[PDB]
Motif scaffolding. Structure first.
Motif, PDB file in Angstrom:
ATOM      1  N   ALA A 158      -5.992   9.963   3.614  1.00  0.00           N
ATOM      2  CA  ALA A 158      -4.690  10.279   3.054  1.00  0.00           C
ATOM      3  C   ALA A 158      -4.039   9.046   2.461  1.00  0.00           C
ATOM      4  N   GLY A 159      -4.602   7.882   2.782  1.00  0.00           N
ATOM      5  CA  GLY A 159      -4.022   6.638   2.320  1.00  0.00           C
ATOM      6  C   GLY A 159      -2.657   6.291   2.973  1.00  0.00           C
ATOM      7  N   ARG A 160      -2.408   6.650   4.246  1.00  0.00           N
ATOM      8  CA  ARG A 160      -1.143   6.336   4.876  1.00  0.00           C
ATOM      9  C   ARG A 160      -1.048   4.872   5.274  1.00  0.00           C
ATOM     10  N   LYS A 161       0.191   4.265   5.273  1.00  0.00           N
ATOM     11  CA  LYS A 161       0.352   2.844   5.669  1.00  0.00           C
ATOM     12  C   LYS A 161       0.476   2.647   7.095  1.00  0.00           C
ATOM     13  N   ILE A 162      -0.647   2.469   7.705  1.00  0.00           N
ATOM     14  CA  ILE A 162      -0.606   2.252   9.101  1.00  0.00           C
ATOM     15  C   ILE A 162      -1.087   0.876   9.408  1.00  0.00           C
ATOM     16  N   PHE A 163      -0.483   0.198  10.360  1.00  0.00           N
ATOM     17  CA  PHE A 163      -1.006  -1.104  10.684  1.00  0.00           C
ATOM     18  C   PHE A 163      -1.216  -1.120  12.130  1.00  0.00           C
ATOM     19  N   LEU A 164      -2.244  -1.833  12.542  1.00  0.00           N
ATOM     20  CA  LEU A 164      -2.465  -1.962  13.931  1.00  0.00           C
ATOM     21  C   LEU A 164      -2.102  -3.380  14.317  1.00  0.00           C
ATOM     22  N   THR A 165      -1.450  -3.470  15.437  1.00  0.00           N
ATOM     23  CA  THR A 165      -1.119  -4.758  15.970  1.00  0.00           C
ATOM     24  C   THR A 165      -2.050  -4.985  17.129  1.00  0.00           C
ATOM     25  N   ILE A 166      -2.518  -6.186  17.266  1.00  0.00           N
ATOM     26  CA  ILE A 166      -3.417  -6.500  18.348  1.00  0.00           C
ATOM     27  C   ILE A 166      -2.803  -7.560  19.145  1.00  0.00           C
ATOM     28  N   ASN A 167      -2.508  -7.223  20.373  1.00  0.00           N
ATOM     29  CA  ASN A 167      -1.839  -8.187  21.170  1.00  0.00           C
ATOM     30  C   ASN A 167      -2.634  -9.381  21.506  1.00  0.00           C
ATOM     31  N   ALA A 168      -1.880 -10.380  21.852  1.00  0.00           N
ATOM     32  CA  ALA A 168      -2.507 -11.610  22.207  1.00  0.00           C
ATOM     33  C   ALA A 168      -3.510 -11.299  23.313  1.00  0.00           C
ATOM     34  N   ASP A 169      -3.054 -10.414  24.168  1.00  0.00           N
ATOM     35  CA  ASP A 169      -3.863 -10.016  25.277  1.00  0.00           C
ATOM     36  C   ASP A 169      -5.083  -9.146  24.893  1.00  0.00           C
ATOM     37  N   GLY A 170      -5.072  -8.544  23.714  1.00  0.00           N
ATOM     38  CA  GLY A 170      -6.226  -7.762  23.354  1.00  0.00           C
ATOM     39  C   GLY A 170      -5.815  -6.338  23.104  1.00  0.00           C
ATOM     40  N   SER A 171      -4.703  -5.984  23.688  1.00  0.00           N
ATOM     41  CA  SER A 171      -4.243  -4.643  23.452  1.00  0.00           C
ATOM     42  C   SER A 171      -4.019  -4.436  21.938  1.00  0.00           C
ATOM     43  N   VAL A 172      -4.160  -3.172  21.536  1.00  0.00           N
ATOM     44  CA  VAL A 172      -3.984  -2.664  20.180  1.00  0.00           C
ATOM     45  C   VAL A 172      -2.940  -1.510  20.136  1.00  0.00           C
ATOM     46  N   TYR A 173      -2.121  -1.444  19.077  1.00  0.00           N
ATOM     47  CA  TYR A 173      -1.172  -0.384  18.844  1.00  0.00           C
ATOM     48  C   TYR A 173      -1.094  -0.126  17.371  1.00  0.00           C
ATOM     49  N   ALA A 174      -0.578   1.064  17.062  1.00  0.00           N
ATOM     50  CA  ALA A 174      -0.446   1.405  15.698  1.00  0.00           C
ATOM     51  C   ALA A 174       0.874   1.985  15.293  1.00  0.00           C
ATOM     52  N   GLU A 175       1.209   1.712  14.040  1.00  0.00           N
ATOM     53  CA  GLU A 175       2.416   2.203  13.523  1.00  0.00           C
ATOM     54  C   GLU A 175       2.245   2.463  12.057  1.00  0.00           C
ATOM     55  N   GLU A 176       3.044   3.383  11.661  1.00  0.00           N
ATOM     56  CA  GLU A 176       3.065   3.689  10.269  1.00  0.00           C
ATOM     57  C   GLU A 176       4.350   3.087   9.699  1.00  0.00           C
ATOM     58  N   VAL A 177       4.293   2.669   8.495  1.00  0.00           N
ATOM     59  CA  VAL A 177       5.441   2.016   7.986  1.00  0.00           C
ATOM     60  C   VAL A 177       5.917   2.561   6.637  1.00  0.00           C
ATOM     61  N   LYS A 178       7.259   2.697   6.452  1.00  0.00           N
ATOM     62  CA  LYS A 178       7.943   3.167   5.224  1.00  0.00           C
ATOM     63  C   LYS A 178       9.034   2.198   4.843  1.00  0.00           C
ATOM     64  N   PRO A 179       9.205   2.076   3.587  1.00  0.00           N
ATOM     65  CA  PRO A 179      10.233   1.224   3.083  1.00  0.00           C
ATOM     66  C   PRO A 179      11.623   1.823   3.348  1.00  0.00           C
ATOM     67  N   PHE A 180      12.567   0.911   3.437  1.00  0.00           N
ATOM     68  CA  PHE A 180      13.925   1.348   3.644  1.00  0.00           C
ATOM     69  C   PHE A 180      14.857   0.587   2.765  1.00  0.00           C
ATOM     70  N   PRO A 181      15.578   1.357   1.923  1.00  0.00           N
ATOM     71  CA  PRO A 181      15.456   2.808   1.846  1.00  0.00           C
ATOM     72  C   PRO A 181      14.296   3.220   0.932  1.00  0.00           C
ATOM     73  N   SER A 182      14.056   4.542   0.912  1.00  0.00           N
ATOM     74  CA  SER A 182      12.989   5.224   0.149  1.00  0.00           C
ATOM     75  C   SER A 182      12.908   5.036  -1.375  1.00  0.00           C
TER      76      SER A 182
END
Lengths: 60, 61
Positions: A36-60
């Motif tokens: 779908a081409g969505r803007k998702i980024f994964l963050t990888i913690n210093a510790d190794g953990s990983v998380y994800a988020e999608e991001v949108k500009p503000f405002p649209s």
């Protein structure tokens, strides 16, 4: 300090499979998002953990 | 290196007027966006430039 990578680049490195295990999702979800081409980024913690988020500009 | 803050926290240190100015929008947009608990982060560049993004988890619970 942490790292932050695109869902796509990361999956390119680790493959849908780990990427999915890592985000705790079902594999088809990675592919779809990417497809779908969505803007998702994964963050990888210093510790190794990983998380994800999608991001949108503000405002649209 | 960039700084990064929540809209809310940014709005407290500087006030709603600077906030909108910085982002080129108007006051109400801010205050609304804030009352509604939108998840927005403002990045502040080294050259002092400001920009915002809304952020959501993925996947969604």
């Amino acid at each position: 300090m942490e790292q932050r990578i695109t869902l796509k680049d990361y999956a390119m490195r680790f493959g849908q499979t780990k990427t999915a295990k890592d985000l705790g999702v079902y594999q088809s979800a990675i592919n779809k998002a990417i497809h779908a081409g969505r803007k998702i980024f994964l963050t990888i913690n210093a510790d190794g953990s990983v998380y994800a988020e999608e991001v949108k500009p503000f405002p649209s």
